[PDB]
DNA sequence: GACCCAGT
DNA sequence: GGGTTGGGGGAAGCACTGGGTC
């Protein structure tokens, strides 16, 4: 479903074990409707990789795994023909929904 | 086939009186029974004699009196005494009628008196009706004891209620399931499990009981009853008895449907169970204003509701389990 | 005279028809349901709608405001100026005017003449009967299902918190025993595109319903039991009462919300005699249906004048291009 | 004397109207869904907005400041001078006057005869039971439709993290349990061609709701409780309370945000009588609407005073080309 | 006594107000979205800007620095002397006086009497609930609209990459395996013709907000909890705090910052009565708006003094030609 | 279609570790741009650091980075002229910058 | 139309 | 890049006209 392997990275910026607490990207991706801000919002989340990489090592747990590019194109190839907001929100909301998880990997 | 006749007075009162017929025939057997819906008549079709009907009532009222006398003119703290009862004048008048049948039903004598129905069993009651010009005195709606006793027995066991007082004020929310196309003994008996006996929460930490649409979720959360609604069809009817500042009046009365809420919780609590209740309880206790956005998204399939509640609740405290997130997308896909 | 206004309204972020606040802290806004036809089926949505009681109350409010302009402001009840709207009672026979005059309840002839508020919205007196039907009727303000067809979702309910700061004798904050009034509550405002429809019955102003005609010279004429010159003034006092509607004076919380109000499209019919209402601003087929109803009334012998605002409404009808409610009123006040 | 002001404002860089709590990180800004076209149907789009409560509170703040200079400034609530909008809350049966006196709670007129706060923004008397309708009505602050149509809603929200430097006396910031209340909080700021439609009703000042008229010789005369000079001074102060509205005192957090402002197209109508409200600036095509609301309403017999800025109108009415709002209210206080 | 300062300045490659990298090396600067007029239509663009928190912190630093000069600098805050801007973080009930004493947080008047910085900058005491809004309002720092129109942004970022050198006795850079420090991080700097606007409310120093006036004889008389000489000294310190606000002590990056930051044009008004705030420099048409707001205000009989630079504001305005920045507050302080 | 992954692989070598090269400025400017003109400017700034990275990877033991094929340059050039409206320009402006952060096996 | 009442 | 802080506590509807009996 190319979702379980990308939602855990989105969850890295909300969990208490990583105290940076940037909800602006989650708000931007949750309210993405027409064609562009959905791809722009996920950029902000995927950019803050160093943050998590340093923060996991600052406590002791292994560095977080960055999502593989084997399935990133599944969003670009799907957003094209799904131009209307009828079914585009149907997955845009799930993208932000998967960002609010725990994924306890840093005990 | 007997087909016990059921008088038609109010769409909600008739629901309570007719839907409470089963609690007595179960005590008397009545194998191979059914309840044909009529929207408001809701007639019971059973091939049983009338004699055992009173044998059911005497056992039911024995249970009621055992519950009433146990707790404490004497006023108890039960559903039929002070739980859902908002008026104090009915705190002792209602039980007095209930024990009165002990002098009428035990020796096989029909009812001859006629009492006054309170507002709790039927919200359309009151004091000031309109007929042609102006109002009148007292309560013109007067219910015979036969139909009067048949309502409380179905009210106490089957329909649940939630009470949240907070000192002088008092909020009472009453919910009941009404069949609309077909129903059998499998569903009506299962609906009995939803009843919350002694739902007196008070304190201040349990404030999430604000609003009826939010209290229904909390009532439903801790009752993993039968999930037959995924193949059946049922409707939820709810009404409130507000007593803000000792002012007994109804300020909220809406009609919703319970099937989609059944499906939502059934599809949510499937991947895991330990964390789902913790998550929903945390969002309800902490995100008081945010859980409204979650409940509202259920009867209309609102996508933004599934996110706004989580956004508003995560800021205070949320476990945010992994297996429950995949449960939401099962409904979404 | 006989005016039927209707159309669609685009107002958003407004607190209308709240739940009070006697003890409930979260003041959730009223929520309604509407059905819409799509994908060969019917679906409902939890969308708010505003009752027309707000519209009627604001009509009552504007009636006295436009009635105090003319020097005929004497004939008005005291309770009308305080926005009471009780209209006597089961035993109240005397009236309280601005000057304190006493009115005896015997018939509408001696009531609609000395009092003007009791005629537009009617009254009742269970002691002696003599009920008066409301001459002005409002309609519920509900969102059209075209907006649902193009949305069929979204929150469309803006929940904002509001705080009431409080100070002690020196600036302290109490919790439950210091005698403070600090409060933190919520307010939900409604959005979307709604519809409006208002009917006015100015032909019964000053004419009792029991005896609408004189009928003593073999010539049926209106039974104006009041003075015609002030009757004409009373016409405008109720005709201009709908002007504040088209400006934003709808519902409550006007001091804190003041709905963002602007009508996008409307249709009205004005006539000397009774005429049917066109359509509520709800259904998508609210233009062409009106295009039918007009030809359903012209063949019956009705001198109906159609006023259109941001709608073509075809070309055969002799409609007037209206750009605001005010010139519609200005074109109606003449007759 | 009812006056309607409506127009635009290039209000930006403001953390106004923020939803956050003590135990709530990431204090975020209010967002109101609105209905637009975007060369298609009446779609819904998210956009930050501002509540009219705020505007009412800041109107109160400006009104008390401008009423201090008045010679009758002693006739005001003490709590009003404390920049508090708690007009007769819960917990007290009476308020406190500025000089230290109290106010009695049976008659409505005697409440406002020595107090200028309930006579300008209303009040509520829980224990007593009586109430008063509000004077000034403030509308929400929403951007222009075309502004969000052209940009099709590209975020339009800027989240900035802020922190403090609460370092101990020794000169070290170690653990939370150490005693250093120092942390990272985020503030949201917005921009847009916002609009406002404030309205004031100065014909009801000093007029109790219970007894608005007297009619001692059966003549049109509203029942005024205060001196006519006092009423004129109060009306002038209320009108002067409009300058801070465009002067940057729109909302709170001015110590850290202080949004940028500019006088855009404005329209003000006032003729000392019952006047309909104006059209809000949230809709892009509202200017032409203003060319029809007052075009024939002047011919209805009303001496409508229109003051306009940054708009040519239909060059057919007596629309005064006012420079700024202070001259606008100067032209209003000279006709009362 | 109220003061409004505004105008247009020019900044060149400053790293003021950055989020705070973290592990990340590009130290991203605060980006704010603002409106642009454009001959086509109103659009929005993101530009690097400076929040008001900074301006307020630097104003507080200047205030305490110039208050140390006054002989009455003993009544101060130990946190203020340590250049700390936090106000009573949660964890302690009382506070410590700069003299070394203990300040009881039970009376606002005592707090403002013994704490000069908190009197003008407000404070926050959640433990006892003591609140006081700051007398200074600081806006953001944004490039003007015409500047963005004539430059089109062009991503307006200057990124320079630096390293950290960790040379021990052995003289080895290491490979982050022994405990060395050899990494590569980047800092960016921003330029542009920005604007400034600050509001001073120097009429509440020495006067608690709870009890502004006494009204002992039904006459306007503010009640001051301190001797008038201390109030005058505090006013002088507040006025002198604005002199470094245009000198270069603005922002952060005290190791690489301090760009040119010289004022190109400034406008100011000062009057003991309530006066509006001038338009923050963001637009190409604010000059005539300020001209109107300073011309029509004088017609209302307001004793207001206007100072201006660069722009003479026509010949009808009697505003003097203030050149430097200290002479403005100096001429303001001789006129008390 | 097809060239996005190839250009994203090249952009990945600028933000990953084991290279001692961290330049986020250009990748930030490519994505959150406003006008079509600066898109190609950011592309040039990102692409310029080809020779300095094509030689250090093998010195550090990593495999050399695969330079994007010149055919993809034709596609990225010919995609932007006909698409001038900003409505669907930001999506392609951020599409290539998205693939900068991924799990590419730069240094196995 | 004047009476009635509650528990953490 | 390498560490310190993620809210902090306080508030989170009063009064107000109660609706039944008898």
Grouping H, G, I as helix, E, B as strand and the rest as coil, residue E185 is: strand
What is the spatial distance between Cα F13 and Cα F30, in angstroms, rounded to a whole number? Answer: 16
What is the spatial distance between Cα E4 and Cα B164, in angstroms, rounded to a whole number? Answer: 54
DSSP class of residue B101 equals G
Whether A54 sits inside 8 A of E25 (CB atoms) is: no
SS3 per residue for B263-320: HHHHHHCCCCCHHHHHHHHHHHHHCCCCHHHHHHCCCCCCCCHHHHHHHHHHCCCCCC
Write down the residue that tokens 């200079």 correspond to. D69
Query: Within B158-211, where are the H helices?
Result: 185-191
Whether D191 sits inside 8 A of E32 (CB atoms) is: yes
Q: How far is CA C111 from the centre of its chain?
A: 23
What is the spatial distance between Cα B75 and Cα B89, in angstroms, rounded to a whole number? Answer: 10
Whether F91 sits inside 8 A of A79 (CB atoms) is: yes
Interruptions in chain D after residues (C–N over 2.5 Å): none
C partners (3+ CB pairs within 8 A) are: B, D, E
What is the spatial distance between Cα B128 and Cα E92, in angstroms, rounded to a whole number? Answer: 60
N-term to C-term CA, chain A:
28
What is the spatial distance between Cα A92 and Cα B322, in angstroms, rounded to a whole number? Answer: 19
Paired with B164 in beta bridges are: B171
- Give me the residue from B307, B318, B325 closest to A93, CB to CB: B307
- CB-CB contact of B234 with B177 (8 Å): yes
What is the spatial distance between Cα F7 and Cα F4, in angstroms, rounded to a whole number? Answer: 5
Residue A91 main-chain phi, psi, to 5 deg: -105, -25
Paired with C267 in beta bridges are: C6, C308
Name the closest residue on chain C to residue B249, using Cα atoms.
C22
Whether F34 sits inside 8 A of E159 (CB atoms) is: no
B36 touches strand G (CB under 7 A): no
- Give me the residue from E46, E154, E161 closest to F38, CB to CB: E154
Query: Within chain E, where are the H helices?
Result: 52-67, 78-81, 108-114, 116-121, 145-151, 228-241, 286-298, 326-334
Q: Among A24, A37, A55, A92, pick the best mutation site for testing chain D contact (most D Cβ within 10 A).
A: A24
- Give me the residue from C71, C82, C248 closest to D220, CB to CB: C71
Q: How far is the CA of D305 from the C1' of H13 (A)?
A: 42
Resolution to 1 decimal place, in Å: 3.9
In the numeric block, which tokens belong to residue B202?
Answer: 């008070």
Cβ neighbours of residue E112 under 8 Å, at least 6 residues apart?
Answer: E118, E119, E132, E205, E206, E208, E225
Asked if E324 is an interface residue toward chain A (Cβ–Cβ < 8 A), one would say: no
What is the spatial distance between Cα C306 and Cα A103, in angstroms, rounded to a whole number? Answer: 66
N-term to C-term CA, chain D:
8
What is the spatial distance between Cα C252 and Cα D123, in angstroms, rounded to a whole number? Answer: 16
Angle, helices C228-239/C325-332, rounded to nearest 10 degrees: 160
- Give me the residue from F29, F34, F41 closest to E45, CB to CB: F34
Strand G contacts in B 72-131 (CB under 7 A): 72, 75, 77, 82, 88-89, 91
Whether F101 sits inside 8 A of A49 (CB atoms) is: yes
Q: What is the DSSP string of D110-179?
A: HHHHS-SSHHHH-EE-TTT--EE--S-B---BEE-HHHHHHS-----EEEEEEE-----SSS----GGGT
Query: Within chain D, where are the H helices?
Result: 52-68, 78-81, 109-113, 118-121, 145-150, 228-240, 243-246, 287-293, 325-333
What is the spatial distance between Cα A20 and Cα A30, in angstroms, rounded to a whole number? Answer: 19
- CB-CB contact of E313 with E320 (8 Å): no
- CB-CB contact of A99 with A14 (8 Å): yes
Paired with C5 in beta bridges are: C198, C268
B200 touches strand G (CB under 7 A): yes
Cβ neighbours of residue C117 under 8 Å, at least 6 residues apart?
Answer: C60, C63, C64, C76, C77, C80
Q: How do strand D2-9 and strand D263-270 relate by DSSP bridges?
A: antiparallel
Whether E108 sits inside 8 A of C170 (CB atoms) is: yes
Asked if D230 is an interface residue toward chain A (Cβ–Cβ < 8 A), one would say: no
- Give CA angle at C278 (C274, C283), nearest 5°: 160
Q: How far is the CA of B241 from the C1' of H16 (A)?
A: 17
SS3 per residue for chain C: CEEEEEEEEECECECCCCCCCCCCCEECCCCEEEEEEECCEEEEEEECCECCHHHHHHHHHHHHHHHCCCCCCCCCEHHHHCCCCCCCCCCCCCCCECCCCCCCCCCCHHHHCCCCHHHHCCEEECCCEEEECCCEECCCECECHHHHHHHCCCCCEEEEEEEECCCCCCCCCCCCCCCCCCEEEEEEEECCEEEEEEEEECCCCCCCCCCCECCCCCCCCECCCCCHHHHHHHHHHHHHHHCHHHCCCCCCCCCCCCCECCEEEEEEEEECCCCCCCCCCCCCCCCHHHHHHHHHHHCCCCCCEEEEECCCCCCCCCCEEECCHHHHHHHHCCC
Asked if D26 is an interface residue toward chain A (Cβ–Cβ < 8 A), one would say: yes
Q: Which nucleotide has the least CA–C1' distance to B169?
A: G6
Asked if F50 is an interface residue toward chain A (Cβ–Cβ < 8 A), one would say: no
Nearest to C182 by CA among C170, C167, C194: C167
Q: Which nucleotide has the least CA–C1' distance to B82?
A: G6
Grouping H, G, I as helix, E, B as strand and the rest as coil, residue B109 is: coil
CA distance E125 to chain C (A): 10
B246 touches strand G (CB under 7 A): yes
- B285 burial class (0-12, 13-18, 19+ CB within 10 angstroms)? middle
CA dihedral D60, D65, D69, D71 (to 10 degrees): 30
Q: Which residues of C touch E130 (CB under 8 A)?
A: 171-172
Q: How many contacts (CB atoms, under 8 Å) link B and C?
A: 59
For H9, which residue's CA is nearest its C1'?
E126
Strand H contacts in C 166-225 (CB under 7 A): 173, 175-176, 180-185
In the numeric block, which tokens belong to residue E329?
Answer: 């507050």
- CB-CB contact of C189 with C29 (8 Å): yes
Paired with B142 in beta bridges are: B116
Q: What share of chain A is helix, strand, coil (3-state, %, to 5)?
A: 55, 0, 45
Kindly tell me the number of DSSP H helices and DSSP E strands found in chain D. Answer: 9, 15
N-term to C-term CA, chain F:
27
Grouping H, G, I as helix, E, B as strand and the rest as coil, residue A89 is: helix
For G4, which residue's CA is nearest its C1'?
B89
Q: Which residues of E touch F52 (CB under 8 A)?
A: none
Q: How many contacts (CB atoms, under 8 Å) link D and E?
A: 197
Write down the residue that tokens 């305490």 correspond to. E64
CA distance B273 to chain A (A): 16
Nearest to C33 by CA among B255, A34, D223: B255
Residue B316 main-chain phi, psi, to 5 deg: -95, -65
What is the spatial distance between Cα E140 and Cα E118, in angstroms, rounded to a whole number? Answer: 22
- Give me the residue from E32, E210, E218 closest to D189, CB to CB: E32
Q: How far is the CA of B152 from the C1' of G3 (A)?
A: 27
Residue C89 main-chain phi, psi, to 5 deg: -170, -165
C-alpha pair distances (Å), B47 with each of B5, B50, D283, E212, E320: 13, 10, 69, 86, 106
Grouping H, G, I as helix, E, B as strand and the rest as coil, residue D226 is: coil
What is the spatial distance between Cα A64 and Cα A43, in angstroms, rounded to a whole number? Answer: 18
- Give the count of beta carbons closer than 10 Å to the beta carbon of residue D141: 30
Residues in A lying within 8 Å of E, measured between beta carbons: 20, 48, 50-51, 53-55
- CB-CB contact of E142 with E282 (8 Å): yes
- Give the count of beta carbons closer than 10 Å to the beta carbon of residue C213: 11
Whether B133 sits inside 8 A of C28 (CB atoms) is: no
Query: Within B72-199, where are the H helices?
Result: 89-100, 145-157, 185-191
- CB-CB contact of F97 with A43 (8 Å): yes
- Give me the residue from C191, C246, C330 closest to D35, CB to CB: C191
- CB-CB contact of D8 with D144 (8 Å): yes
What is the spatial distance between Cα E10 and Cα D334, in angstroms, rounded to a whole number? Answer: 43
Radius of gyration for the alpha carbons in chain F, expressed in angstroms and rounded? 14
CA quadruple E276, E280, E283, E288: dihedral sign? positive
Grouping H, G, I as helix, E, B as strand and the rest as coil, residue E124 is: strand
Paired with B143 in beta bridges are: B115
Paired with D21 in beta bridges are: none
In the numeric block, which tokens belong to residue D85?
Answer: 């909008």
In the numeric block, which tokens belong to residue C110?
Answer: 């001696």
Grouping H, G, I as helix, E, B as strand and the rest as coil, residue A54 is: helix
What is the spatial distance between Cα C79 and Cα C88, in angstroms, rounded to a whole number? Answer: 9
Q: How far is the CA of C56 from the C1' of H18 (A)?
A: 28
- Give the count of beta carbons closer than 10 Å to the beta carbon of residue A1: 11
Paired with C74 in beta bridges are: none
Report the length, in residues, of chain B: 333
- Which nucleotides of strand H are protein-proximal, with an atom < 7 A from a CB? 1-22
Nearest to D275 by CA among D215, D200, D217: D200
What is the spatial distance between Cα E111 and Cα E210, in angstroms, rounded to a whole number? Answer: 13
Nearest to C37 by CA among C283, C308, C296, C318: C283
For H3, which residue's CA is nearest its C1'?
A58
- CB-CB contact of D49 with D11 (8 Å): no
Strand H contacts in E 91-150 (CB under 7 A): 91, 124, 126, 129
CA dihedral D51, E42, F27, E22 (to 10 degrees): -30
For H8, which residue's CA is nearest its C1'?
D22
Cβ neighbours of residue C22 under 8 Å, at least 6 residues apart?
Answer: B242, B244, B245, B247, B251
In the numeric block, which tokens belong to residue B159?
Answer: 């329909």
- Longest CA span, chain F: 45
Q: Which residues of D touch C150 (CB under 8 A)?
A: 41-43
Query: Within F13-89, where are the H helices?
Result: 24-31, 36-47, 51-54, 56-59, 70-80
Nearest to D6 by CA among D270, D335, D297: D270
Whether E28 sits inside 8 A of F21 (CB atoms) is: no
Q: Which residues of B touch A11 (CB under 8 A)?
A: 320
Name the closest residue on chain F to residue E26, using Cα atoms.
F24
N-term to C-term CA, chain E:
8
What is the spatial distance between Cα F27 and Cα F11, in angstroms, rounded to a whole number? Answer: 8
Q: How do strand D43-48 and strand D31-36 relate by DSSP bridges?
A: antiparallel
- Give the determination technique: cryo-EM
CA quadruple C306, C310, C312, C313: dihedral sign? negative
- CB-CB contact of E186 with F23 (8 Å): yes
Q: Which residues of E touch C179 (CB under 8 A)?
A: none
Q: What is the DSSP string of E12-77?
A: EEE--SB---SS-SSBPBPEEEEEE--SS--EEEEEE-B-HHHHHHHHHHHHHHHHTTSTTTTSSB
- Give me the residue from F5, F87, F102 closest to A67, CB to CB: F102
In the numeric block, which tokens belong to residue D212?
Answer: 């608005």
Q: Among D18, D22, D23, D183, pick the best mutation site for testing chain B contact (most B Cβ within 10 A).
A: D23
Q: Which residues of D touch E77 (CB under 8 A)?
A: none
């Amino acid at each position: 479903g190319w979702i379980r392997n990308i939602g855990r990275y989105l969850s890295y910026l909300v969990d208490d074990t990583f105290e940076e607490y940037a909800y602006d990207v989650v708000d931007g991706i949750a309210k993405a409707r027409t064609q562009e801000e959905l791809l722009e919002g996920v950029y902000k989340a995927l950019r803050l990789a160093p943050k998590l990489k340093k923060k996991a090592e600052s406590k002791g747990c292994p560095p977080p795994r960055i999502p593989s590019p084997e399935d990133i194109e599944a969003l670009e190839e799907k957003v094209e023909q799904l131009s209307n907001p009828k079914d585009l929100r149907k997955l845009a909301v799930s993208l932000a929904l998967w960002a609010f998880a725990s994924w306890n990997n840093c005990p | 086939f007997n087909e016990f006749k059921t008088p038609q007075i109010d769409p909600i009162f008739d629901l309570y009186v007719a839907y409470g017929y089963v609690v007595s025939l179960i005590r008397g057997g009545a194998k191979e029974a059914t309840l044909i819906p009529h929207g408001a008549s809701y007639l019971i079709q059973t091939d049983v004699s009338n004699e055992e009907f009173r044998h059911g009532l005497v056992d039911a009222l024995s249970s009621m009196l055992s519950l009433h006398i146990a707790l404490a003119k004497l006023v108890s703290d039960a559903d039929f005494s002070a739980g859902a009862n908002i008026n104090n004048v009915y705190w002792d008048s209602v039980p007095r009628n209930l024990e009165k049948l002990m002098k009428d039903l035990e020796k096989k004598r029909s009812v001859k008196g006629t009492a006054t129905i309170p507002i709790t069993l039927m919200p359309s009651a009151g004091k000031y009706m309109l007929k042609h010009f102006g109002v009148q005195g007292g309560n013109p709606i007067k219910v015979d004891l036969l139909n009067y006793a048949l309502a409380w027995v179905g009210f106490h066991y089957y329909t649940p209620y939630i009470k949240y007082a907070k000192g002088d004020t008092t909020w009472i929310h009453i919910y009941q399931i009404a069949p609309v196309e077909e129903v059998d003994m499998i569903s009506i008996l299962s609906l009995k499990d939803l009843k919350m006996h002694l739902p007196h929460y008070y304190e201040s930490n349990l404030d999430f009981l604000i609003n009826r649409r939010l209290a229904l979720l909390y009532h439903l959360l801790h009752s993993e009853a039968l999930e037959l609604f995924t193949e059946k069809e049922f409707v939820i009817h709810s009404y409130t008895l507000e007593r803000s500042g000792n002012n007994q009046a109804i300020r909220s009365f809406e009609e919703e449907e319970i099937g989609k809420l059944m499906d939502f919780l059934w599809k949510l609590k499937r991947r895991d169970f330990y964390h789902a209740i913790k998550f929903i309880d945390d969002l309800l206790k902490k995100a008081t204003e945010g859980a409204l956005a979650l409940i509202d998204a259920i009867m209309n399939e609102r996508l933004e509701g599934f996110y706004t509640a989580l956004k508003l609740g995560k800021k205070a405290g949320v476990v945010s389990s992994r297996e429950i997130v995949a449960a939401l997308e099962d409904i979404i896909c | 005279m006989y005016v039927r206004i209707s159309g669609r309204i685009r107002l958003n972020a407004h607190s209308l028809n709240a739940q009070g606040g006697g003890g409930t802290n979260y003041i959730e806004i009223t929520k309604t349901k509407v059905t819409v036809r799509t994908e060969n089926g019917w679906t409902v949505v939890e969308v708010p709608a505003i009752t027309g009681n707000m519209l009627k109350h604001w009509h009552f409010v504007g009636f006295v405001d436009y009635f105090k302009t003319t020097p005929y402001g004497v004939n008005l009840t005291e309770r009308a100026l305080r926005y009471n709207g009780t209209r006597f009672g089961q035993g109240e026979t005397t009236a309280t005017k601005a000057n304190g005059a006493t009115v005896q309840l015997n018939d509408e002839a001696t009531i609609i003449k000395e009092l003007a508020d009791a005629d537009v919205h009617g009254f009742l007196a269970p002691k002696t009967g003599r009920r008066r039907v409301s001459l002005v009727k409002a309609s519920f303000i509900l969102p059209t299902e075209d907006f649902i067809k193009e949305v069929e979702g979204e929150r469309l309910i803006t929940a904002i918190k509001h705080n009431r700061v409080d100070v002690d004798e020196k600036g302290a904050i109490g919790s439950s025993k210091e005698g403070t009034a600090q409060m933190l509550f919520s307010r939900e405002y409604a959005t979307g595109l709604y519809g409006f429809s208002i009917v006015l019955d100015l032909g019964l102003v000053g004419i009792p319903q029991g005896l609408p005609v004189k009928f003593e010279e073999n010539q049926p004429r209106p039974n104006i039991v009041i003075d015609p010159n002030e009757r004409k003034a009373r016409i405008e006092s109720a005709l201009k009462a709908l002007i504040p509607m088209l400006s934003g004076y709808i519902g409550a919380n006007l001091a804190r919300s003041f709905p963002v109000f602007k009508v996008e499209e409307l249709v009205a019919i004005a006539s000397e005699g009774p005429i049917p209402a066109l359509v509520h601003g709800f259904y998508e087929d609210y233009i062409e249906a009106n295009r039918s109803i007009i030809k359903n009334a012209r063949a019956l012998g009705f001198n109906i004048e159609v006023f259109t605002y941001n709608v073509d409404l075809g070309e055969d009808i002799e409609a007037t291009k209206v750009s605001s409610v005010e010139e519609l009123v200005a074109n109606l006040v003449k007759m």
